[PDB]
Protein backbone atom coordinates (compact mmCIF):
# COMPACT_ATOMS: atom_id res chain seq x y z
CA UNK A 1 0.00 0.00 0.00
CA UNK A 2 0.81 3.68 -0.21
CA UNK A 3 3.09 4.20 2.82
CA UNK A 4 4.12 0.65 3.82
CA UNK A 5 6.30 -2.13 2.46
CA UNK A 6 3.10 -4.12 1.88
CA UNK A 7 0.07 -5.08 -0.04
CA UNK A 8 -1.31 -4.99 -3.29
CA UNK A 9 -3.05 -3.56 -6.28
CA UNK A 10 -5.81 -0.85 -6.45
CA UNK A 11 -5.91 2.12 -8.82
CA UNK A 12 -5.79 5.90 -8.15
CA UNK A 13 -4.68 9.41 -8.88
CA UNK A 14 -5.56 11.56 -5.93
CA UNK A 15 -8.68 13.08 -4.73
CA UNK A 16 -10.75 12.97 -7.87
CA UNK A 17 -13.50 10.55 -8.69
CA UNK A 18 -12.35 7.04 -9.60
CA UNK A 19 -9.37 6.41 -7.34
CA UNK A 20 -8.82 3.20 -5.33
CA UNK A 21 -5.96 2.89 -3.01
CA UNK A 22 -3.10 0.46 -3.09
CA UNK A 23 -0.31 0.87 -5.69
CA UNK A 24 0.39 0.20 -8.55
CA UNK A 25 -1.52 0.99 -11.49
CA UNK A 26 -2.06 0.09 -15.22
CA UNK A 27 -4.27 2.35 -17.51
CA UNK A 28 -5.41 6.01 -17.68
CA UNK A 29 -6.11 7.59 -14.29
CA UNK A 30 -3.12 9.68 -14.46
CA UNK A 31 0.27 10.49 -13.26
CA UNK A 32 2.95 10.74 -10.51
CA UNK A 33 2.58 8.33 -7.62
CA UNK A 34 3.79 4.88 -8.39
CA UNK A 35 5.76 2.28 -10.21
CA UNK A 36 4.25 0.95 -13.45
CA UNK A 37 3.76 2.83 -16.70
CA UNK A 38 0.04 3.53 -16.66
CA UNK A 39 -2.39 4.71 -14.08
CA UNK A 40 -5.48 2.55 -13.37
CA UNK A 41 -6.80 -1.08 -12.90
CA UNK A 42 -3.72 -3.19 -12.48
CA UNK A 43 -2.69 -6.79 -12.63
CA UNK A 44 0.26 -8.74 -13.80
CA UNK A 45 -1.63 -11.24 -11.58
CA UNK A 46 -0.82 -14.27 -13.74
CA UNK A 47 -3.07 -17.16 -14.60
CA UNK A 48 -5.58 -18.04 -17.25
CA UNK A 49 -5.36 -17.00 -20.91
CA UNK A 50 -2.91 -14.19 -20.16
CA UNK A 51 -0.82 -16.21 -17.69
CA UNK A 52 1.96 -14.71 -19.71
CA UNK A 53 1.21 -11.39 -18.15
CA UNK A 54 -1.82 -11.32 -15.97
CA UNK A 55 -5.32 -11.96 -14.89
CA UNK A 56 -7.12 -8.62 -15.23
CA UNK A 57 -10.44 -8.52 -13.33
CA UNK A 58 -13.78 -6.70 -13.23
CA UNK A 59 -14.78 -7.89 -9.75
CA UNK A 60 -11.63 -6.28 -8.38
CA UNK A 61 -8.99 -8.82 -7.32
CA UNK A 62 -5.99 -7.74 -9.38
CA UNK A 63 -2.50 -7.62 -8.11
CA UNK A 64 0.85 -5.87 -7.83
CA UNK A 65 2.34 -4.56 -4.50
CA UNK A 66 3.80 -1.14 -4.07
CA UNK A 67 4.81 2.49 -4.62
CA UNK A 68 6.98 4.73 -6.78
CA UNK A 69 7.21 7.68 -9.12
CA UNK A 70 4.73 7.96 -11.96
CA UNK A 71 1.31 6.45 -11.34
CA UNK A 72 -1.34 7.83 -8.95
CA UNK A 73 -0.42 11.38 -8.15
CA UNK A 74 -0.54 14.89 -9.44
CA UNK A 75 -3.32 15.18 -11.95
CA UNK A 76 -6.01 17.40 -13.29
CA UNK A 77 -8.16 14.34 -12.90
CA UNK A 78 -9.73 13.98 -16.32
CA UNK A 79 -8.23 10.56 -16.94
CA UNK A 80 -11.35 8.68 -17.50
CA UNK A 81 -13.15 7.37 -14.52
CA UNK A 82 -15.18 10.46 -14.67
CA UNK A 83 -13.92 13.24 -12.54
CA UNK A 84 -12.34 15.65 -12.32
CA UNK A 85 -10.03 17.92 -10.52
CA UNK A 86 -6.49 19.10 -10.06
CA UNK A 87 -5.31 16.73 -7.38
CA UNK A 88 -1.95 15.68 -6.15
CA UNK A 89 0.16 13.00 -4.55
CA UNK A 90 3.70 11.60 -4.64
CA UNK A 91 4.97 8.75 -2.47
CA UNK A 92 8.06 6.50 -2.16
CA UNK A 93 8.44 4.33 0.98
CA UNK A 94 11.33 2.86 2.98
CA UNK A 95 11.20 -0.23 5.18
CA UNK A 96 9.49 -0.51 8.57
CA UNK A 97 7.78 -3.49 10.26
CA UNK A 98 7.61 -5.17 13.69
CA UNK A 99 10.68 -3.90 15.62
CA UNK A 100 13.26 -5.40 17.98
CA UNK A 101 16.92 -5.74 19.22
CA UNK A 102 19.78 -3.24 19.76
CA UNK A 103 22.45 -2.22 17.25
CA UNK A 104 26.01 -1.40 18.36
CA UNK A 105 28.95 0.20 16.52
CA UNK A 106 30.97 3.45 17.09
CA UNK A 107 32.41 3.66 20.62
CA UNK A 108 35.62 5.36 21.81
CA UNK A 109 35.74 7.87 24.60
CA UNK A 110 38.64 9.89 26.00
CA UNK A 111 41.00 12.42 24.48
CA UNK A 112 40.16 15.76 26.09
CA UNK A 113 40.98 18.83 23.88
CA UNK A 114 43.47 20.61 21.65
CA UNK A 115 44.69 18.41 18.76
CA UNK A 116 43.01 16.48 15.91
CA UNK A 117 40.03 14.72 17.32
CA UNK A 118 39.80 11.03 16.70
CA UNK A 119 36.57 9.08 17.31
CA UNK A 120 33.22 10.60 18.17
CA UNK A 121 30.41 8.36 18.02
CA UNK A 122 26.85 9.58 18.23
CA UNK A 123 24.17 7.91 16.27
CA UNK A 124 21.18 7.93 13.98
CA UNK A 125 20.01 7.24 10.47
CA UNK A 126 17.36 8.58 8.17
CA UNK A 127 17.51 11.64 5.90
CA UNK A 128 18.48 12.41 2.30
CA UNK A 129 21.51 12.27 3.23
CA UNK A 130 22.38 11.78 6.92
CA UNK A 131 24.24 14.75 8.41
CA UNK A 132 27.04 16.67 10.10
CA UNK A 133 29.35 16.77 13.14
CA UNK A 134 31.32 18.98 15.49
CA UNK A 135 34.47 18.94 17.60
CA UNK A 136 34.11 18.12 21.19
CA UNK A 137 35.40 15.84 23.58
CA UNK A 138 33.21 15.12 26.54
CA UNK A 139 32.00 17.32 29.16
CA UNK A 140 31.49 20.70 30.67
CA UNK A 141 32.20 23.86 28.59
CA UNK A 142 35.24 24.11 26.36
CA UNK A 143 38.10 26.61 26.32
CA UNK A 144 38.26 29.06 23.38
CA UNK A 145 40.78 29.29 20.54
CA UNK A 146 43.63 26.86 21.32
CA UNK A 147 45.49 24.59 18.85
CA UNK A 148 42.46 23.22 17.05
CA UNK A 149 39.87 20.67 18.11
CA UNK A 150 38.80 18.72 15.09
CA UNK A 151 36.67 16.44 12.98
CA UNK A 152 34.57 13.38 13.84
CA UNK A 153 35.49 11.47 10.72
CA UNK A 154 37.72 8.71 12.04
CA UNK A 155 34.86 7.45 14.18
CA UNK A 156 33.47 4.03 13.39
CA UNK A 157 31.03 4.94 10.64
CA UNK A 158 27.98 3.08 9.43
CA UNK A 159 25.29 5.20 7.73
CA UNK A 160 22.13 3.10 7.52
CA UNK A 161 22.13 0.76 10.48
CA UNK A 162 21.23 3.85 12.51
CA UNK A 163 24.43 4.13 14.38
CA UNK A 164 26.37 7.20 13.35
CA UNK A 165 25.17 10.74 12.58
CA UNK A 166 25.57 14.31 13.75
CA UNK A 167 26.87 15.78 16.98
CA UNK A 168 26.57 19.56 16.73
CA UNK A 169 28.02 21.70 19.48
CA UNK A 170 30.51 24.34 18.79
CA UNK A 171 34.07 24.19 19.86
CA UNK A 172 34.83 26.28 16.79
CA UNK A 173 36.92 28.08 19.45
CA UNK A 174 39.26 25.22 20.59
CA UNK A 175 40.71 24.32 23.94
CA UNK A 176 43.70 23.69 26.18
CA UNK A 177 42.18 23.90 29.64
CA UNK A 178 42.44 20.63 31.52
CA UNK A 179 39.99 17.91 32.60
CA UNK A 180 37.80 15.95 30.17
CA UNK A 181 35.28 18.72 29.96
CA UNK A 182 35.15 20.43 26.65
CA UNK A 183 32.08 20.21 24.37
CA UNK A 184 29.50 17.38 24.46
CA UNK A 185 26.04 16.95 22.92
CA UNK A 186 25.12 14.21 20.47
CA UNK A 187 22.08 12.30 21.53
CA UNK A 188 19.72 11.09 18.77
CA UNK A 189 17.44 8.39 17.29
CA UNK A 190 17.91 4.56 16.95
CA UNK A 191 18.15 2.37 13.89
CA UNK A 192 15.53 0.16 12.39
CA UNK A 193 12.03 -1.28 12.90
CA UNK A 194 13.13 -4.89 13.03
CA UNK A 195 16.08 -4.13 15.33
CA UNK A 196 16.89 -0.60 16.55
CA UNK A 197 20.04 1.13 17.77
CA UNK A 198 21.42 3.10 20.75
CA UNK A 199 23.75 6.05 21.45
CA UNK A 200 27.43 6.87 22.17
CA UNK A 201 30.12 9.61 22.75
CA UNK A 202 31.77 12.92 21.67
CA UNK A 203 34.89 13.47 19.64
CA UNK A 204 38.33 13.40 21.02
CA UNK A 205 41.62 15.36 20.96
CA UNK A 206 44.18 14.53 23.67
CA UNK A 207 45.49 16.68 26.54
CA UNK A 208 48.67 15.64 28.20
CA UNK A 209 51.45 15.79 30.74
CA UNK A 210 54.97 15.82 29.23
CA UNK A 211 55.77 17.48 32.56
Amino acid sequence: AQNITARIGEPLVLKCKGAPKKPPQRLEWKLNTGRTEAWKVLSPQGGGPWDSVARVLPNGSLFLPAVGIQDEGIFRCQAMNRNGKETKSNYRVRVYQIPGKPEIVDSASELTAGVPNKVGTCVSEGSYPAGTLSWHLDGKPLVPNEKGVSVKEQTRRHPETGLFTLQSELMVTPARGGDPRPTFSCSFSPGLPRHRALRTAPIQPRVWEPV
Binding site: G46, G48, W50, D51
Partner: protein
Protein backbone atom coordinates in the same frame (compact mmCIF):
# COMPACT_ATOMS: atom_id res chain seq x y z
CA UNK B 1 3.29 -24.64 -31.00
CA UNK B 2 5.93 -23.76 -33.40
CA UNK B 3 7.31 -22.31 -36.69
CA UNK B 4 10.40 -23.48 -38.55
CA UNK B 5 12.90 -21.79 -36.28
CA UNK B 6 10.30 -19.69 -34.66
CA UNK B 7 8.35 -19.46 -31.50
CA UNK B 8 7.18 -22.17 -29.23
CA UNK B 9 4.21 -21.64 -27.07
CA UNK B 10 6.12 -21.85 -23.91
CA UNK B 11 5.81 -24.77 -21.50
CA UNK B 12 5.04 -24.28 -17.84
CA UNK B 13 2.37 -25.72 -15.60
CA UNK B 14 0.26 -23.23 -13.71
CA UNK B 15 -2.28 -25.78 -12.49
CA UNK B 16 -0.03 -26.70 -9.59
CA UNK B 17 -0.57 -23.71 -7.33
CA UNK B 18 -0.03 -25.63 -4.11
CA UNK B 19 3.59 -26.61 -4.12
CA UNK B 20 4.25 -27.85 -0.58
CA UNK B 21 0.77 -28.22 0.90
CA UNK B 22 -0.63 -30.45 -1.83
CA UNK B 23 1.91 -32.75 -3.15
CA UNK B 24 2.06 -35.66 -0.78
CA UNK B 25 1.72 -38.62 -3.12
CA UNK B 26 5.30 -39.41 -2.32
CA UNK B 27 6.40 -40.91 0.98
CA UNK B 28 4.18 -42.20 3.74
CA UNK B 29 1.16 -40.97 1.87
CA UNK B 30 -0.68 -42.63 -1.05
CA UNK B 31 -3.47 -40.02 -0.85
CA UNK B 32 -3.80 -36.27 -1.38
CA UNK B 33 -6.30 -34.84 -3.76
CA UNK B 34 -5.99 -33.50 -7.29
CA UNK B 35 -8.05 -30.57 -6.12
CA UNK B 36 -5.51 -29.74 -3.42
CA UNK B 37 -3.13 -28.15 -5.95
CA UNK B 38 -5.21 -25.61 -7.87
CA UNK B 39 -7.81 -23.91 -5.64
CA UNK B 40 -5.73 -23.26 -2.50
CA UNK B 41 -3.29 -20.60 -3.73
CA UNK B 42 -2.00 -19.09 -0.47
CA UNK B 43 0.39 -21.76 0.62
CA UNK B 44 4.03 -20.94 1.24
CA UNK B 45 3.76 -17.70 3.21
CA UNK B 46 1.33 -19.49 5.57
CA UNK B 47 4.32 -21.31 7.02
CA UNK B 48 6.03 -18.30 8.63
CA UNK B 49 5.87 -16.30 11.87
CA UNK B 50 3.59 -13.37 12.59
CA UNK B 51 5.32 -10.87 10.29
CA UNK B 52 4.13 -10.98 6.66
CA UNK B 53 2.51 -14.37 6.23
CA UNK B 54 -0.07 -13.59 3.54
CA UNK B 55 0.60 -13.81 -0.19
CA UNK B 56 1.16 -16.11 -3.15
CA UNK B 57 -0.16 -15.11 -6.54
CA UNK B 58 1.48 -15.55 -9.94
CA UNK B 59 1.82 -18.57 -12.21
CA UNK B 60 2.72 -19.65 -15.73
CA UNK B 61 0.72 -21.73 -18.18
CA UNK B 62 1.74 -23.48 -21.39
CA UNK B 63 -0.72 -23.58 -24.17
CA UNK B 64 0.01 -20.41 -26.10
CA UNK B 65 1.03 -19.04 -23.06
CA UNK B 66 4.10 -17.15 -22.16
CA UNK B 67 4.02 -14.13 -24.53
CA UNK B 68 6.19 -12.11 -22.15
CA UNK B 69 9.24 -14.28 -21.33
CA UNK B 70 10.11 -17.22 -23.54
CA UNK B 71 7.92 -17.37 -26.52
CA UNK B 72 11.09 -15.74 -27.69
CA UNK B 73 12.72 -19.02 -26.59
CA UNK B 74 11.98 -20.28 -30.00
CA UNK B 75 11.19 -16.97 -31.67
Amino acid sequence: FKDPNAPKRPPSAFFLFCSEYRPKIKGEHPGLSIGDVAKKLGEMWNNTAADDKQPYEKKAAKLKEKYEKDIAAYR
